[PDB]
Amino acid sequence: GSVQIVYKPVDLSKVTSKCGSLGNIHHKPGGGQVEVKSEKLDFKDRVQSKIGSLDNITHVPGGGNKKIETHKLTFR
Amino acid sequence: GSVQIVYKPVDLSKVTSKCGSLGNIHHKPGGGQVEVKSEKLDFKDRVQSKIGSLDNITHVPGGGNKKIETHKLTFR
Amino acid sequence: GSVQIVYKPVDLSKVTSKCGSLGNIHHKPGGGQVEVKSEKLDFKDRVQSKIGSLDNITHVPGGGNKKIETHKLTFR
Amino acid sequence: VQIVYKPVDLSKVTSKCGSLGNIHHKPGGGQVEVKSEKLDFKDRVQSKIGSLDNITHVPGGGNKKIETHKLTF
Amino acid sequence: VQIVYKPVDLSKVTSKCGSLGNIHHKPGGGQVEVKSEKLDFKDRVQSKIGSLDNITHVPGGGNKKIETHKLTF
Amino acid sequence: VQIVYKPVDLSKVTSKCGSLGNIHHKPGGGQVEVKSEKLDFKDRVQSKIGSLDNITHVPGGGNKKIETHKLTF
Amino acid sequence: VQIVYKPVDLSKVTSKCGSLGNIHHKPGGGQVEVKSEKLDFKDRVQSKIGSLDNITHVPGGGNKKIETHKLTF
Amino acid sequence: VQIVYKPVDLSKVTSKCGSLGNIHHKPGGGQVEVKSEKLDFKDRVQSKIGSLDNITHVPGGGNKKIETHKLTF
Amino acid sequence: VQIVYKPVDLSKVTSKCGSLGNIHHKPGGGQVEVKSEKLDFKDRVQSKIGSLDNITHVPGGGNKKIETHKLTF
Amino acid sequence: GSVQIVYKPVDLSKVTSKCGSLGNIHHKPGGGQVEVKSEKLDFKDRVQSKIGSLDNITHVPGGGNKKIETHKLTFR
Amino acid sequence: GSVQIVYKPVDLSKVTSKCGSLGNIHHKPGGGQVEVKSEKLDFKDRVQSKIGSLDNITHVPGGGNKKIETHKLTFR
Amino acid sequence: GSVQIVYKPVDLSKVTSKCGSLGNIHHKPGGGQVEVKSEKLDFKDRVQSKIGSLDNITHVPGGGNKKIETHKLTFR
């Protein structure tokens, strides 16, 4: 029959960090020697060809203190 | 039949970082040597060819204290 | 049939970073030596080709404390 | 005949020398005391009381590179 | 005839010397005391009381890279 | 006839030498006391009271790399 | 008849009481340190840091003298 | 008849109490340190760090001199 | 007939009581250190760190002298 | 015969004191009871009669560093 | 016969006191009781009679660093 | 016969007192009780008579650094 829903999440969260110093972080990758020989390079569908490339990320957050909080409610 | 929905999500949160110093963060990738030989290069659909590239991200936020919150409610 | 919806999400939050100093953040990639050879190059749809390219991002926000809050409500 | 003289050099030569990358989180903080009726210093006396003296000499650290790409027919 | 002279050098040559990468988290913090009627120092005396000295010398640390690449028919 | 002279060098030549990578978590913290009527130093005296004096000399550490890629028909 | 009533009193009555005649040559001279992120005092807390607190209560020390020089014929 | 009533009193009556005549030559001189994230004091706490306190009480030290000197023929 | 009533009193009545005549040459001079995340005091705590707290209570020490020099013929 | 006298005293004297404090010096003498009975006091020559007297000196020099230096020379 | 007298007494002297403080110097003598009875007091020559006197000197010099020097020379 | 007298006494002297403070110097004598009795008192030459007398001296010089130098010379 009749419906009552009471939905009262209550959060008191301290998500913290207290870092004194981040030092001389060095990021220095090096590619060497790469060679490809062929009659064809022949790439059909969704091919990733990455020959001698470098992908480099230097992420240095002074705090990275991520919070995710997802809610839902449903009725029919 | 009646419906009552009372939806009072409460948050109190501290999402912090008391970072004292970020130092001499150095990012210096080096590409080396790369050499590709063929009669054809032939790329048809969604091909990513990266020969000898560098992709370089240097992300240094004094705080990256990311909060995501998400809500939904649905009725029929 | 009667419907009462009361929708009062509360947040009080401190999403902060008391960062003392950002140092000598250096970003210096170097592309090296690249060689590509063919009788033909033939690229069709959604092809990417990144021969010897540099992409560089240098992102240094004094705070990057991204908050997202998303809400929805729905009825039929 | 052909001669195809194509040497490749991608070398790196480096001298990281002195005081480098050291962290030094909070040196000091201790009490130091001297009490006297006389202090008397008179010839090439070096005196330090509670100092945090960082000092560095690098008369070295030098780099040398020589290459001689000679070719002759 | 052909001669294809293509040496490749990808060397790293490094000197890494003196004081490097040391953390030194919270040196000091200890009480030091000296008490007298006289302190009296008179020829080439080195005196240190409580000091957090870090003196460093590097007369060395050299690098020498030498190459010759002669070809002749 | 052909001569394909293609030496490849990937060498790492290194001198890591001195004081390296040490952690040094909380050096010190201990009491020191000296009491007198006189202290008296008069020719080449070295005197230390509660100091945490770190010191490093590197007159060595040199690198030499030599190559003679000679070719002759 | 004669009565020669001549009592002599040269008495001294004294209360030397409290802190008296103490010399106190150079109290103090020592380092004192407190370090924290929080200090929190909230009900009848008495706190002293390096103080040289001399204090003295003398609700006593009182003197009483009674004499009754009665004579009767 | 004669009565020669001449009592003599040369008494000294003394209370000498609390802290008296003490020399206290150079109290202190020693390093004291306290280190924390929190100090937290909440009901009738007495805290002392390095203090050269000298608190003194004298509720006592009283003197009472009573005399009667009756004569009768 | 005669009565020569001449009592002589030379008495010394004394209460020397408390802390008296002590020399106390150089009390202290020693290191003290405390390290924590928390100190937490919550009901009638007495806490002392390196203090040289001298203290003295004298509720006693009283003097009473009573005399009844009665004469009768 | 002929006379030469050379009289060269040479004095470099430090007579010192370095007193930090002189305390609560008390001087309190007390005479008691004294009685003399006689037919005569009869004093003829250089008599000192000192009956029940007090002679009191309270000398407290902050330094009392006395020097005496007496010289003479003579010829006939 | 000739006479030569050369009389060069030299003094250099420091006759000092670095006194920090002179305290509560108290001088309080008390005469008691004194009683002299006779048919005569009869004092003839150089008699000193002191009955019940007090002589009281309170000398408190911040320095009493007395120097006496004395010289003589004599010839006939 | 020839006489040469050369008379050069030299002094350089510091006769000092760096007195920091003179305190509560108290001088309080008290004469008590004295009784003298005779049929006669008879005093002749150079008699002194000091019955119940107080002599008091209170001498507190900030410095009393008395120097005497006395010289003489004589010939016949």
Author numbering:
A (entry chain C), B (entry chain A), C (entry chain E), J (entry chain H), K (entry chain G), L (entry chain I): 304 to 379
D (entry chain D), E (entry chain B), F (entry chain F), G (entry chain K), H (entry chain J), I (entry chain L): 306 to 378
Task: Quote the passages of the study that discuss this structure, keeping the authors' original sentences.
Some filaments with three or four protofilaments also formed, including the previously described triple and quadruple helical filaments. As time progressed, filaments with two J-shaped protofilaments disappeared and filaments with two C-shaped protofilaments appeared. Among J-shaped and C-shaped protofilaments, the opposing β-strands comprising residues 305–320 and 365–380 hardly changed their conformation, confining all differences to the β-helix turn and its surrounding residues. The formation of a tighter packing of residues near the 332PGGG335 motif in the C-shaped protofilaments compared to the J-shaped protofilaments may drive this conformational change. Finally, the change from earlier C-shaped protofilaments to the final, more closed, C-shaped protofilaments of PHFs involves a second inwards rotation of the β-helix turn, which again concurs with a rearrangement of the 332PGGG335 motif.
Residues 297–391 (using the numbering of the longest human brain tau isoform) constitute the proteolytically stable core of paired helical filaments (PHFs) from the brains of individuals with Alzheimer’s disease. Here we use time-resolved cryogenic electron microscopy to study the in vitro assembly of recombinant truncated tau (amino acid residues 297–391) into paired helical filaments of Alzheimer’s disease or into filaments of chronic traumatic encephalopathy. At the end of both assembly reactions, most intermediate amyloids disappear and filaments with the same ordered cores as those from human brains remain.
